[PDB]
Amino acid sequence: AAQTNAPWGLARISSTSPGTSTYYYDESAGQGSCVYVIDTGIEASHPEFEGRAQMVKTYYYSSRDGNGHGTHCAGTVGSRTYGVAKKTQLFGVKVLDDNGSGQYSTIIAGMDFVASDKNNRNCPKGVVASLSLGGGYSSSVNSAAARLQSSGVMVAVAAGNNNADARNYSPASEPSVCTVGASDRYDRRSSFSNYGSVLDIFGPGTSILSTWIGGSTRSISGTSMATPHVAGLAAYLMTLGKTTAASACRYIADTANKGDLSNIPFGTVNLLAYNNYQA
């Protein structure tokens, strides 16, 4: 299939080269997979989700996304116009409040919840969790992400937007999950993006157009915008039987666009998420 005039990040993950505007993807589109968006929530009402989004757990007074971040990243995973995996099921898990922050314990609790909740959903193609969040290093945050990954969920987490090594950040520093850095539309590492050997892959993360609360759209930047590209792509490739949750991060690294990014510090992978789609 082809999305013309697609957002640049979508086009980027279906293309070996920057600058294109068409998103080429297999028609299956992540159908049969599920992606938990662990964030500020999702405005499941947004038309772009076509009913495929739903709130499954909040840790605050409302399940409402009063911030926008979570709806934005759900959209990059699987909105019709802004999504990587346009037929995937989205489950919102609101661990961040409407100000965009959340205690470590609440984030740990939300990952434990996904590990269990998936067992009472229908995701025949497998389960992905997109974690567009992160704070300072925390071994218990890290081990929550690892348990989530161990439980059979492909976990993708943001490297963090500190322009520093991601080893000092969590869950970015957990080795078993897929830590995702950001690139911009000129195949440069995003100026804010963390880096380091714990990075596994880069996604589009600068000026990423996606759904916003109130039924709108918005373009924002961050490794938290790159994360859902890779989550969506995992959900996509899983639906295609190309890989599984345990193997998706390494599969995506193996099949990435290599060496295309500039300003990659020595000791950081130079790999860009790529769906290798051939019509």
Swiss-Prot record:
Binding locations of Ca(2+) 2: 16, 260
Top EC group: hydrolase
Top-level taxon of the source organism: Eukaryota
GO CC terms: extracellular region
Residues where Ca(2+) 1 binds: 175, 177, 200
Assigned EC number: 3.4.21.64
Disulphides: 34-123, 178-249
Protein name: Proteinase K
Cofactor(s) named in the record: Ca(2+)
General function of this protein: Hydrolyzes keratin at aromatic and hydrophobic residues.
Gene Ontology MF terms: metal ion binding; serine-type endopeptidase activity
Swiss-Prot/TrEMBL catalytic activity: Hydrolysis of keratin, and of other proteins with subtilisin-like specificity. Hydrolyzes peptide amides
Any one GO biological process: proteolysis
Active-site annotation: 39 (charge relay system), 69 (charge relay system), 224 (charge relay system)
Cofactor note: Binds 2 calcium ions per subunit.
Keyword field: Calcium, Disulfide bond, Hydrolase, Metal-binding, Protease, Serine protease, Signal, Zymogen
Transmembrane segments: none
Assigned protein family: Belongs to the peptidase S8 family.
Record-annotated Peptidase S8 domain positions: 7-279
